[PDB]
Amino acid sequence: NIVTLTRFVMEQGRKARGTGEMTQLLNSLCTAVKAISTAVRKAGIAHLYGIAGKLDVLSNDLVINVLKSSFATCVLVTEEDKNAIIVEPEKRGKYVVCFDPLDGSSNIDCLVSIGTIFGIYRKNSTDEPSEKDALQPGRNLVAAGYALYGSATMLVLAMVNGVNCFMLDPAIGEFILVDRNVKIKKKGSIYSINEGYAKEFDPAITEYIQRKKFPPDNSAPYGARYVGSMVADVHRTLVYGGIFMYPANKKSPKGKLRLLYECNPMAYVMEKAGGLATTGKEAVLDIVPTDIHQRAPIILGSPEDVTELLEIYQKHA
Amino acid sequence: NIVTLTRFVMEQGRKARGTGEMTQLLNSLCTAVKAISTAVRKAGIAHLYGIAGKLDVLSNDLVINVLKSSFATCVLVTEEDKNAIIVEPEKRGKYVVCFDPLDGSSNIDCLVSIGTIFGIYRKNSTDEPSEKDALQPGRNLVAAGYALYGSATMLVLAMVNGVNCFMLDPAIGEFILVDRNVKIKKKGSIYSINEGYAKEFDPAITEYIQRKKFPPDNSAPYGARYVGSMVADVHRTLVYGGIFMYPANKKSPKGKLRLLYECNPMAYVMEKAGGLATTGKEAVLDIVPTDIHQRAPIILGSPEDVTELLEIYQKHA
Amino acid sequence: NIVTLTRFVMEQGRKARGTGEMTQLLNSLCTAVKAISTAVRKAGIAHLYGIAGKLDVLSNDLVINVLKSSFATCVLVTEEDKNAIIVEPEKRGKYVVCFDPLDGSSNIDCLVSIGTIFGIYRKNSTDEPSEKDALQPGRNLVAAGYALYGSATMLVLAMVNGVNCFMLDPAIGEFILVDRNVKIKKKGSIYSINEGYAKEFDPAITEYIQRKKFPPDNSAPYGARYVGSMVADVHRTLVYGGIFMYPANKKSPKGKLRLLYECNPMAYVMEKAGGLATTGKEAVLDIVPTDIHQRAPIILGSPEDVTELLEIYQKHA
Amino acid sequence: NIVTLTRFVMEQGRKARGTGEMTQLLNSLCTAVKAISTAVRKAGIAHLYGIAGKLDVLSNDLVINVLKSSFATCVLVTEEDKNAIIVEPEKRGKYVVCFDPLDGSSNIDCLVSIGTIFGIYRKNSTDEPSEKDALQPGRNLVAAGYALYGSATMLVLAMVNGVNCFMLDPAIGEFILVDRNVKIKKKGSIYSINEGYAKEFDPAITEYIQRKKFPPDNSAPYGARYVGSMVADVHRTLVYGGIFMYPANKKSPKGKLRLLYECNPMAYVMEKAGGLATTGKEAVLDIVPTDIHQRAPIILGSPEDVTELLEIYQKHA
Ligand SMILES: Nc1ncnc2c1ncn2[C@@H]1O[C@H](COP(=O)(O)O)[C@@H](O)[C@H]1O
Ligand SMILES: Nc1ncnc2c1ncn2[C@@H]1O[C@H](COP(=O)(O)O)[C@@H](O)[C@H]1O
Ligand SMILES: Nc1ncnc2c1ncn2[C@@H]1O[C@H](COP(=O)(O)O)[C@@H](O)[C@H]1O
Ligand SMILES: Nc1ncnc2c1ncn2[C@@H]1O[C@H](COP(=O)(O)O)[C@@H](O)[C@H]1O
Ligand SMILES: O=P(O)(O)OC[C@@H]1O[C@H](COP(=O)(O)O)[C@@H](O)[C@@H]1O
Ligand SMILES: O=P(O)(O)OC[C@@H]1O[C@H](COP(=O)(O)O)[C@@H](O)[C@@H]1O
Ligand SMILES: O=P(O)(O)OC[C@@H]1O[C@H](COP(=O)(O)O)[C@@H](O)[C@@H]1O
Ligand SMILES: O=P(O)(O)OC[C@@H]1O[C@H](COP(=O)(O)O)[C@@H](O)[C@@H]1O
Ligand SMILES: [Tl+]
Ligand SMILES: [Tl+]
Ligand SMILES: [Tl+]
Ligand SMILES: [Tl+]
Numbered sequence A, B, C, D: 001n002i003v004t005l006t007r008f009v010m011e012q013g014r015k016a017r018g019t020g021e022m023t024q025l026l027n028s029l030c031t032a033v034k035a036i037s038t039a040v041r042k043a044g045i046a047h048l049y050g051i052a053g054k055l056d057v058l059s060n061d062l063v064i065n066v067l068k069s070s071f072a073t074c075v076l077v078t079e080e081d082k083n084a085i086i087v088e089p090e091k092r093g094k095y096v097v098c099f100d101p102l103d104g105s106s107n108i109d110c111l112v113s114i115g116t117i118f119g120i121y122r123k124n125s126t127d128e129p130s131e132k133d134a135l136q137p138g139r140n141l142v143a144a145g146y147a148l149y150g151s152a153t154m155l156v157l158a159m160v161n162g163v164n165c166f167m168l169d170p171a172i173g174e175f176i177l178v179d180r181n182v183k184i185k186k187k188g189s190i191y192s193i194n195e196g197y198a199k200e201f202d203p204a205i206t207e208y209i210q211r212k213k214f215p216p217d218n219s220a221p222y223g224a225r226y227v228g229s230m231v232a233d234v235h236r237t238l239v240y241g242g243i244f245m246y247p248a249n250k251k252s253p254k255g256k257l258r259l260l261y262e263c264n265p266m267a268y269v270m271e272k273a274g275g276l277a278t279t280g281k282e283a284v285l286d287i288v289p290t291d292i293h294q295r296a297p298i299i300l301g302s303p304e305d306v307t308e309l310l311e312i313y314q315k316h317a
């Protein structure tokens, strides 16, 4: 029967026998996402155009404000903030949340899909909360997911027991569970990478890509897709299968995507869905960070596709 | 002071001393686009999931009905219909409309941007309306444009005087003019093509793509982007500059995109914005259609980029 | 087949061979009403309460701006402004518009139904526009109507040919025609008046009210209803029949309601629907205004009920 | 800072140290109300009007369906159902909810304010759940309140510690706490009753009403208001003060309003706000019902106004 995100979260909080603090965090997040969706869809824009009487900064304020008001967090790391934000002792909670309020911000002007990425850690070292508390490997994530503002708005949530997708019915401001226990196809038929950096790809990426266009056994070549918005390329991967890649290159010898609020959440989601997320040399989730804005290379998607690339990495080493 | 689509179309109908038949038609399109936008964003989905107890199809039905009720059309060609729709003599006007109600339908499940494409012709000749009236070259278009259901919904309308972009304020259901007399960049920095077909690209396309990744003059390479929905790929091109391509290959020696309701509308917008739209051999708008579902290869975008490719084509002539 | 306000106004402008100045004006009103509706229903209130960090006034500003930008008006009389607004010679059209942007403003805090009232005159005379152009008797109205923001938003438009009701589909921001050529019941069963002023009603009003509660012919008594917002009380009267009254008393020997932007528009709708609108002494539409904020007593509704009262008035003459 | 209904309810559930079952009930109710609001505002009505591709019954289905899915109820009493609905042992919970899904249904066609009224009891006699479980005096209510669909949508919730009002921001489908610990003025200046039944009022009502129009000490007479929709007249009373009355008459020797799903909830709300709710002879909340559809006379509002009427009842006895 009808399952709303509000009901699902509360139920899981009950089975889990939690104190209701994490439930509060999850409900504040949901609220922040409906707010950003509305802003993203340009509601009320007639007022900027003088009918009479920023989107990334606004998103940052909504997230930070709604999260602090939940009384469940103590440390916040935003892609928009150079420093980790320590919550007032007044509003503190036991959770640390790393997030990208509006990923794909360069795409705003072209009206391409954008999203919000989040990762939630539980503060374990009980000392005054600080930046150090956010420096945990993703293998330590309690919950992670993202909201994609594409043709429709969807919220993907991942936790210990699985990945579930919720579609937003904008008519009643409610997220509906449209898919339970999501698992990615073992093998896909689409590869996703910015081939404009061909000149700077390592030999392993080079070989794999060419293997997709000219398959050794004359099978059907893979189709190519690259929206240029991580949340959008990763969501397509999750739903239809395949492989997404943002390896290291010249401008980004350590990749472009950040570990804490972009790489780790998508890797956590991928792994819970039955897929793989690697650096090419090691699992993304086992990297212990040193800088909150640390970057990391990432390859994620169907297990068989990711394994095939790993085998080529091993061969050129 | 603010300009809405309704106000704009009306002032334009007035300066042109029209009978008001085309204004009625442009207002019918506006309404259809808002109705589709709403459906695309999933309003009401809670009911489909039993709160109280096909999208390409709904779109088709919406456009066809809203258009017939305009009393301004005589023939309608749809991507979804094998044969052209001849209007009941009662609601028969003088306009022929070609459209793709929801382009990128394959993308629906992944929530990737999708849109509506349309082209309007004035029925030439004085005899019982038939498919033959839609078979006019693109150069004979009265109006053409598209609606993109992406992060926000936008309608781009191109007519003899230029191209204008209207953003939908979903809060009041009104398209606000946000950019007027749009012109495209002379030279962009992004190329768009499905490189999964590399194995079957003609030698000219191969060389160009090669030149974008490894510039012979040691200039910075072009970035790559390919959403997978024409309306999104073309909209990005018009706004940020660059080039979009869908040449022939084993994927039909004639390309995949249809001439009447995909290629022509987009080529018209391009030319009006200052770009070019070619098949590599001739201008898209000058082709005399032979069938309403005729496909055609297409290359469009910034003039300097399109010309650079045309030069390579001539080389391999 | 479905009729929208935009389509209707346009077909009507065409049958009447208008220049399209009044169509532009009616489309400007439509937009203003949708913008106000949205504000009334509190969309965006979360921001006023710090989610990310006057209504009568906003309404006034919306109508005045949207109307000026129509280039179809020369003089605007508002309930909120002491003096009439003369349009900048640039945006000067030939229409004079009288309106109450948000009637029942005192009701705002209790969330009782409220609405917008308007009357449109054609500037008679050929000299610099002034308040004097608004001082025309109601019988000289070109169009009049109201928008009611109640359980749903409805626009009622009355013109020489009749009265039509349009319901707002807030999902697509479009007014759909739901009732055409509306006529009122000959005799209703509800009387509407603020009986808190009993102490000061003239003897005729006293006797009538007495006759509705204790029918001398032993017929069933009339039911009583008095919302407190004229637009809601009048809309109920037009749809269900009955009588609405606001006679003189110590609450101004001339009544409370204004002639130009409250009484006249409503009297016009009434007469066009088949009812009557009198002061008890003369038809409201035949009064020659002396001042733009002139008040006048009013009695409107089903013809048999209004006539029954007029007879009682004559008795006490 | 920003307080949503979701957050407020959860917080109160935590302080209360509840098992989260009642929180689930309250969250299901909230969802049902946003759904009914959307339906009431006529969203999607363009589809009934053939753009191509009941309100009281629909409301009943939404409430019943959303409540059963909460797994927190065992008995339901609807104004629309002749019999109390026993929930399947599968979906049972410990709560009994009495409700009027859409009060003021006769007013739908006139677009007057309407609302949903609810009352929540906790099943105490642990025997197979049945109708008898609903037959509890209102003094036993755990929570009660109503949703008013007027100019804006508001949800009033009352519990042991106070009455709080939440306004719906339709843009993000979220209820915001706009007023905390609401208390009604000790004395008001508006009386609300259907004077059309004058002929059948008892001597006590008769005297009091006339005392409001012709005050003994020449003070200012009370103003009169009567929307004809209980939720709307009761809300105005709560916010602005005064007295609402629906005494017994001929057609209704025991009043018209029902005890369990109309009278008790509003009486519970009134008492928590510091006002009074009486039958004229005794408190509404202390009546032990015998029939689930039992009717009862009711007088509620400011304490000083209600006391003054009670003194007149005592005098004529
Ligand atoms: N909504 C929930 N869903 C799943 N697990 C939860 C939820 N709430 C709390 N938990 C779990 O119980 C632990 C402590 O919860 P809490 O006491 O609310 O901080 C969490 O870190 C998870 O292990
Ligand atoms: N709204 C309008 N905007 C721009 N051109 C228009 C408009 N209406 C009519 N036209 C033009 O005038 C011709 C005939 O108009 P019509 O009588 O409405 O069919 C059109 O085909 C265009 O050339
Ligand atoms: N949309 C319309 N609907 C009904 N009557 C109209 C419309 N437009 C113009 N008229 C009429 O024609 C006259 C002059 O129109 P106009 O040239 O637009 O000012 C008006 O005052 C009405 O008599
Ligand atoms: N959201 C809440 N707000 C206030 N009281 C609550 C809430 N939830 C539970 N309670 C209370 O605790 C009792 C049992 O709650 P429960 O165990 O959830 O059934 C209720 O009947 C109220 O006394
Ligand atoms: O938020 P940003 O600054 O626009 O960056 C977003 C990221 O940028 C990547 C693509 O960048 P390239 O242009 O280098 O491919 C995506 O996969 C990620 O969304
Ligand atoms: O409606 P469809 O079947 O999804 O077709 C859409 C078109 O399909 C093209 C992409 O096709 P490829 O996968 O072959 O690149 C896009 O450019 C156009 O939107
Ligand atoms: O905008 P306002 O100041 O609230 O005035 C509205 C009018 O006020 C009348 C009611 O006044 P009384 O309280 O005197 O009956 C209604 O009939 C009209 O809407
Ligand atoms: O739901 P219903 O059948 O329309 O009844 C509603 C009630 O009816 C009362 C008024 O009825 P009267 O016409 O008898 O005054 C209001 O106070 C209540 O909303
Ligand atoms: Tl960002
Ligand atoms: Tl980044
Ligand atoms: Tl299509
Ligand atoms: Tl196609």
Ligand SMILES: [Tl+]
Pocket: C056, C079, C080, C100, C101, C102, C103, C104, C105
């Ligand atoms: Tl006003």
Ligand SMILES: [Tl+]
Pocket: C256, C257, C258, C262
């Ligand atoms: Tl007034």
Ligand SMILES: [Tl+]
Pocket: D056, D079, D100, D101, D102, D103, D104, D105
């Ligand atoms: Tl009812």
Ligand SMILES: [Tl+]
Pocket: D256, D257, D258, D262
């Ligand atoms: Tl009732």
